[PDB]
PDB file of C-alpha atoms in Angstrom:
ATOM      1  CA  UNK R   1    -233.785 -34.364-101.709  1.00 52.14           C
ATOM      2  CA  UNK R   2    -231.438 -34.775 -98.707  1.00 53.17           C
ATOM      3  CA  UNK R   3    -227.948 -33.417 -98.691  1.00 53.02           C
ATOM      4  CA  UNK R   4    -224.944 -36.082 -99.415  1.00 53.27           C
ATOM      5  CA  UNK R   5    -221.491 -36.071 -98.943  1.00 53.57           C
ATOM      6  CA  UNK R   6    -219.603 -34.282-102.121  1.00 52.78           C
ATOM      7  CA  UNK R   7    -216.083 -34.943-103.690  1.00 51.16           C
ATOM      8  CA  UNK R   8    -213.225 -34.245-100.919  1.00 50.21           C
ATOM      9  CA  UNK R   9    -211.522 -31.276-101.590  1.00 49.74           C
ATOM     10  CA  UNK R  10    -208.280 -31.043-103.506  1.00 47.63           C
ATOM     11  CA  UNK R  11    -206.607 -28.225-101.926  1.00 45.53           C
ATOM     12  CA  UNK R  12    -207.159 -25.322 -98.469  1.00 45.28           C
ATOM     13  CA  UNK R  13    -206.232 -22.270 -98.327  1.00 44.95           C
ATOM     14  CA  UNK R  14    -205.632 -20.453 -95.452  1.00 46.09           C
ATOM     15  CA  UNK R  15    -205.806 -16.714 -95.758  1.00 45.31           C
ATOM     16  CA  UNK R  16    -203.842 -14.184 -92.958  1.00 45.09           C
ATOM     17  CA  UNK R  17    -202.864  -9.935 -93.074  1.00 49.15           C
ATOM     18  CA  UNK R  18    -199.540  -9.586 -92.983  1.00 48.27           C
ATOM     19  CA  UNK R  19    -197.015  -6.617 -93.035  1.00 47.94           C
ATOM     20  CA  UNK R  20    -193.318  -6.153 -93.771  1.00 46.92           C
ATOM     21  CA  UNK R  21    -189.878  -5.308 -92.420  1.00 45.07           C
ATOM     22  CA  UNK R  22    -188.298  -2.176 -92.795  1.00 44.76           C
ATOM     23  CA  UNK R  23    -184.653  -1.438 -93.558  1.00 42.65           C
ATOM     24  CA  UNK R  24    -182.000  -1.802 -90.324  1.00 45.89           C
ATOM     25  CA  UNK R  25    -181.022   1.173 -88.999  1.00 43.94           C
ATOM     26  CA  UNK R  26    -180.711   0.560 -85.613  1.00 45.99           C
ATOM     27  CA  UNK R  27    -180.951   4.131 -83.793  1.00 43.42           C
ATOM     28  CA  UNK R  28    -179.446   3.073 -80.519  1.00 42.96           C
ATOM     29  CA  UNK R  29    -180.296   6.336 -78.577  1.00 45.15           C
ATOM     30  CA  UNK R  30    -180.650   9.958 -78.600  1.00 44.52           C
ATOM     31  CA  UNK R  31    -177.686  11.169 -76.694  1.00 44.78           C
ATOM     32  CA  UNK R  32    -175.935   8.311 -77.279  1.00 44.88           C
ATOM     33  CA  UNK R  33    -172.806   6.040 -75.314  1.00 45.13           C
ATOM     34  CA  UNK R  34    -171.892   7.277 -71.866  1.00 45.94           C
ATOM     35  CA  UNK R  35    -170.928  11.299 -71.943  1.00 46.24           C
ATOM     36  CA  UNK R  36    -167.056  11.091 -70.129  1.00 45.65           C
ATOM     37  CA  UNK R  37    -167.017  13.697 -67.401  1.00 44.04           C
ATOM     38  CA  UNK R  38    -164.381  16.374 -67.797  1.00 40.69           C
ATOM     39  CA  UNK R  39    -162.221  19.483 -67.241  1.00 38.80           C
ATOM     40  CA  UNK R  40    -163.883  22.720 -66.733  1.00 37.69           C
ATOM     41  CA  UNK R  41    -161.569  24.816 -68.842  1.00 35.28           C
ATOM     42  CA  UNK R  42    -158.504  27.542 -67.612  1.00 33.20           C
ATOM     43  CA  UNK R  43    -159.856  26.190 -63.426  1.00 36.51           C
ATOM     44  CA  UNK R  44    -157.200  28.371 -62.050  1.00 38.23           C
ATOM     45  CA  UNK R  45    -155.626  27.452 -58.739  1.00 38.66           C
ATOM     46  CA  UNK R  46    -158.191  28.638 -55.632  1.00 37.66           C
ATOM     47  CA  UNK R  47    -155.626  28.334 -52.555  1.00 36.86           C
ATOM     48  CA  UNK R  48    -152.020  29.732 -52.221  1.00 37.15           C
ATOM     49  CA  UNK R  49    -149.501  29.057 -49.591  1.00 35.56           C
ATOM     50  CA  UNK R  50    -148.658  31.614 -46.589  1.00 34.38           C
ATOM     51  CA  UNK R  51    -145.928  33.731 -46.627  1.00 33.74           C
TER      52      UNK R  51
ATOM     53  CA  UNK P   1    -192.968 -21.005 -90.268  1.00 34.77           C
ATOM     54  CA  UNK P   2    -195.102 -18.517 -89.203  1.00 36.08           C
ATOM     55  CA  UNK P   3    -194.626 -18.481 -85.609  1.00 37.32           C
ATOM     56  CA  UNK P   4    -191.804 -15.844 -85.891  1.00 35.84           C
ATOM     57  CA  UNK P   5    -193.438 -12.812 -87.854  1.00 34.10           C
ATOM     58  CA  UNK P   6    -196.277 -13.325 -85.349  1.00 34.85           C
ATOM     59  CA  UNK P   7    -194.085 -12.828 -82.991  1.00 34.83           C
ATOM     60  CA  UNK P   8    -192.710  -9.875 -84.207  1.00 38.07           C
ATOM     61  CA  UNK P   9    -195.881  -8.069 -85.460  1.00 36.57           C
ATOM     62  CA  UNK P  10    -196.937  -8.595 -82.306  1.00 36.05           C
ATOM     63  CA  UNK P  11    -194.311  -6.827 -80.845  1.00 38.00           C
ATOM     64  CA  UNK P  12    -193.975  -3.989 -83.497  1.00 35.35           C
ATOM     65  CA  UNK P  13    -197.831  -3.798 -82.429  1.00 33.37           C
ATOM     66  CA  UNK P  14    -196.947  -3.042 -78.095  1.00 31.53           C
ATOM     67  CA  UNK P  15    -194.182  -0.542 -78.781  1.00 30.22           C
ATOM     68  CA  UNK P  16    -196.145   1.534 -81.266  1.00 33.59           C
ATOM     69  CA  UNK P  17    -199.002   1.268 -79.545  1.00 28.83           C
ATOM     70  CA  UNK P  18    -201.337  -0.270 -81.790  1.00 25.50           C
ATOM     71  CA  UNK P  19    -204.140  -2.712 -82.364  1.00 27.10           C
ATOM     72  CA  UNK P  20    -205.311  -2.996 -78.722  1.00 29.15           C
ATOM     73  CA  UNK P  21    -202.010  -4.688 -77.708  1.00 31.80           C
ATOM     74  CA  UNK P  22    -201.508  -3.291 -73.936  1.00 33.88           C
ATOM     75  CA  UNK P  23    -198.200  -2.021 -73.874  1.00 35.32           C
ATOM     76  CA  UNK P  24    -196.819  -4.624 -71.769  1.00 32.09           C
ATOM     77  CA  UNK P  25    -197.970  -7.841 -73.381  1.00 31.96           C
ATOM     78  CA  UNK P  26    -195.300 -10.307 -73.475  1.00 32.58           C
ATOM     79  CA  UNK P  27    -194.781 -11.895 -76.877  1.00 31.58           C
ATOM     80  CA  UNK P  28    -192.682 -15.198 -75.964  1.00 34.96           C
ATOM     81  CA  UNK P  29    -191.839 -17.709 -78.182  1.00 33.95           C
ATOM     82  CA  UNK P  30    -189.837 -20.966 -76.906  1.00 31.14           C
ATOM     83  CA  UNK P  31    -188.472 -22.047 -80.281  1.00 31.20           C
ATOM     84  CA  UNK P  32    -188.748 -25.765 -80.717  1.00 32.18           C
ATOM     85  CA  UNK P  33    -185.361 -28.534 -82.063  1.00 31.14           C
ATOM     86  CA  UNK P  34    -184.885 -30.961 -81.370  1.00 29.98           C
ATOM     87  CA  UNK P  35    -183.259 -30.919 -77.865  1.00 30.18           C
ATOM     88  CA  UNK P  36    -184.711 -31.295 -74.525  1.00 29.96           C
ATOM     89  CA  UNK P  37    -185.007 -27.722 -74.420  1.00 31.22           C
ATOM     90  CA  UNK P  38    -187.597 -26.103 -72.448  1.00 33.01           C
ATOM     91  CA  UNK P  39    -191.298 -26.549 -73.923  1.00 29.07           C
ATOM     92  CA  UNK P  40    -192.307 -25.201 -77.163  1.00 30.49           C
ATOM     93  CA  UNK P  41    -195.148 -22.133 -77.961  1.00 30.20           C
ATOM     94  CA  UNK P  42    -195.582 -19.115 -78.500  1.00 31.98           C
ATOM     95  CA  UNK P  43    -197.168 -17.796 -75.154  1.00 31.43           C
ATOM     96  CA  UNK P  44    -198.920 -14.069 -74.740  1.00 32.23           C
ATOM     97  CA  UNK P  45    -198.592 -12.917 -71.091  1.00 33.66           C
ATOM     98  CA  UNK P  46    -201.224  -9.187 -70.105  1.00 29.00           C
ATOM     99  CA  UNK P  47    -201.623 -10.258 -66.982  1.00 29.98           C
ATOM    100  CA  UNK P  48    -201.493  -7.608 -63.517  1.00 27.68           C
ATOM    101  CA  UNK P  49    -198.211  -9.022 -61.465  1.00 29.57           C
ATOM    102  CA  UNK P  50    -195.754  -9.607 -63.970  1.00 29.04           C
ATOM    103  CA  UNK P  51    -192.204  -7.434 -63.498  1.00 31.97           C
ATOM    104  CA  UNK P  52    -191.267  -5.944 -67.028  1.00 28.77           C
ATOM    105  CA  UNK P  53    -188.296  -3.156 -67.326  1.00 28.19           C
ATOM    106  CA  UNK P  54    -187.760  -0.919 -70.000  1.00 28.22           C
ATOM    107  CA  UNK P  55    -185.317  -1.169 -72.697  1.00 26.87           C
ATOM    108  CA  UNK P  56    -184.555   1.118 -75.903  1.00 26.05           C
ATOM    109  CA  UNK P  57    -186.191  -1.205 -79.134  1.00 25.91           C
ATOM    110  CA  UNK P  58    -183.309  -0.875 -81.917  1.00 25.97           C
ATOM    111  CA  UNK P  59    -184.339  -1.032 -85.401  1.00 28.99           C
ATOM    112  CA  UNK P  60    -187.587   1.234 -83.942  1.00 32.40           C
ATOM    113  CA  UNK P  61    -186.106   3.318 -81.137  1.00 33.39           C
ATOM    114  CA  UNK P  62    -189.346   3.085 -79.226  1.00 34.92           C
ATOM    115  CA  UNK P  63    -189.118   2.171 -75.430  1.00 30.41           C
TER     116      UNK P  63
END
């Protein structure tokens, strides 16, 4: 009326949650690359010699 | 072969601030050949003195 040993499994499973990938877009960044600094346009020339 | 999309849910997990993951954990994962290489495992760093720096996360744009 005891318990005994039984047959030795034949197989394990070993159960996990998992999700998946999505596709690459790779949206580097909002305002991207570094702006170049630049002419303000017309200027005009602020100093004129004398005379 | 599972070591790797651990890795990554776990950090898809930080950066979109889910689970309970603090947003700072870091996921590292020594990848194992077979060269003397420094030792494998995947370690899991939340500890208070650590340096971390941010950096824009491609393929999630995220921070």
């Amino acid at each position: 009326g005891g318990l005994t040993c039984a047959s030795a499994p034949q197989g394990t499973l070993r159960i996990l949650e998992g999700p998946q990938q999505s596709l690459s877009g790779s949206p580097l960044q909002p305002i991207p690359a570094s702006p170049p600094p630049q002419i303000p346009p017309g200027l005009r020339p602020r100093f004129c010699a004398f005379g | 072969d599972l070591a790797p999309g651990i890795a990554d849910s776990l950090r898809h997990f930080k950066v979109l601030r889910e689970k309970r993951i603090p947003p700072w954990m870091e996921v590292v994962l020594i990848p194992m050949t077979g060269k003397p290489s420094l030792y494998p495992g995947l370690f899991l760093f939340t500890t208070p003195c650590r340096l971390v720096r941010p950096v824009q996360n491609l393929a999630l744009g995220k921070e």
